[PDB]
Amino acid sequence: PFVEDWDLVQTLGEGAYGEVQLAVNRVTEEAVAVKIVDMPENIKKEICILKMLNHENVIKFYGHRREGNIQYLFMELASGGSLFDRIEPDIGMPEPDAQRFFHQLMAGVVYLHGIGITHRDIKPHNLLLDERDNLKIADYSLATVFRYNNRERLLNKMCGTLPYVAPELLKRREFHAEPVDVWSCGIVLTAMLAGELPWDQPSDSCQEYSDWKEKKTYLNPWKKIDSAPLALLHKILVENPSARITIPDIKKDRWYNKPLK
Numbered sequence: 001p002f003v004e005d006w007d008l009v010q011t012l013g014e015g016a017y018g019e020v021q022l023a024v025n026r027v028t029e030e031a032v033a034v035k036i037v038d039m040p041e042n043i044k045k046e047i048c049i050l051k052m053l054n055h056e057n058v059i060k061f062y063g064h065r066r067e068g069n070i071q072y073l074f075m076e077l078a079s080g081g082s083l084f085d086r087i088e089p090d091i092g093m094p095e096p097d098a099q100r101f102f103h104q105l106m107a108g109v110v111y112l113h114g115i116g117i118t119h120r121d122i123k124p125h126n127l128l129l130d131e132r133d134n135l136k137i138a139d140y141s142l143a144t145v146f147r148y149n150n151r152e153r154l155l156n157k158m159c160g161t162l163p164y165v166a167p168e169l170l171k172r173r174e175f176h177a178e179p180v181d182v183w184s185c186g187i188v189l190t191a192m193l194a195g196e197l198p199w200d201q202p203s204d205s206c207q208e209y210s211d212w213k214e215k216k217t218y219l220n221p222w223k224k225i226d227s228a229p230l231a232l233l234h235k236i237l238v239e240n241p242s243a244r245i246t247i248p249d250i251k252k253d254r255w256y257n258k259p260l261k
């Protein structure tokens with residue numbers, strides 16, 4: 001397949017809406033990524049969000065091309081693949097690599113929150129790496145505006161991936177966008193350190209979640225995590241979104257600031 005001067009050489013994944021392909025410009029040899037979307041209101045929103053994005057830990061938007069009922073979303077290519085592929089099942093990854101990616105994830109989330117944007121699907125599959133292993137937050141199809149004209153809007157729609165969602169998202173009619181993103185960053189952190197997800201959803205029915213609230217840290221995935229990153233997770237994975245730690249205080253955490261090998 002092809003679009004204009006770009007050849008679509010290889011699939012890079014597929015979401016709820018479309019497929020992402022590796023686009024090699026036949027002339028310049030430049031390699032980008034193209035989200036191919038079939039058929040209207042959400043894509044106009046997504047482009048609007050993407051156009052604003054200007055940060056080193058956020059996937060750069062290049063432009064869009066419409067070819068009838070098909071939309072092509074040209075984005076920055078992260079040659080290093082995803083963070084998912086760097087996590088070893090049941091092991092995770094080395095602590096210094098986990099801390100580095102967590103720092104870059106915080107920088108990107110701080111950025112998005114700064115411009116009133118919530119990602120709503122922070123998980124390893126949406127965290128891509130460049131050639132120098134710099135983390136990039138990708139896929140903005142679930143992203144939305146939580147702040148406009150310095151007025152905050154509570155979210156009501158239930159969006160995301162169940163093992164990453166904050167518990168208020170399942171139990172509340174309305175909730176603040178930012179503690180939802182902080183929570184998923186905490187699950188990403190857990191995955192990086194234990195190569196395991198803590199539960200299937202943060203609901204009282206799920207025993208693994210109830211075990212966490214009871215402080216049963218002698219259980220997986222918690223027993224694989226060192227006491228210092230575990231202290232941070234104790235503050236991130238808090239049920240009440242008002243009691244939950246914010247990025248300014250995450251930036252003050254001992255493990256966050258711990259010099260690592």
Ligand SMILES: CC(C)(O)Cn1ncc(Nc2ncc3cc(Cl)c(C4CCN(C5COC5)CC4)cc3n2)c1Cl
Pocket residue numbers: 012013014015020033035059075076077078079080081082085125126128138139
């Ligand atoms: C195979 C390999 C060796 O790892 C090479 N490899 N993999 C991916 C890429 N580069 C890359 N760059 C930019 C992209 C932009 C975007 Cl927006 C995406 C989306 C794909 C669909 N996922 C959803 C499915 O579950 C979540 C969300 C992200 C993929 C990209 N992939 C390279 Cl190079």
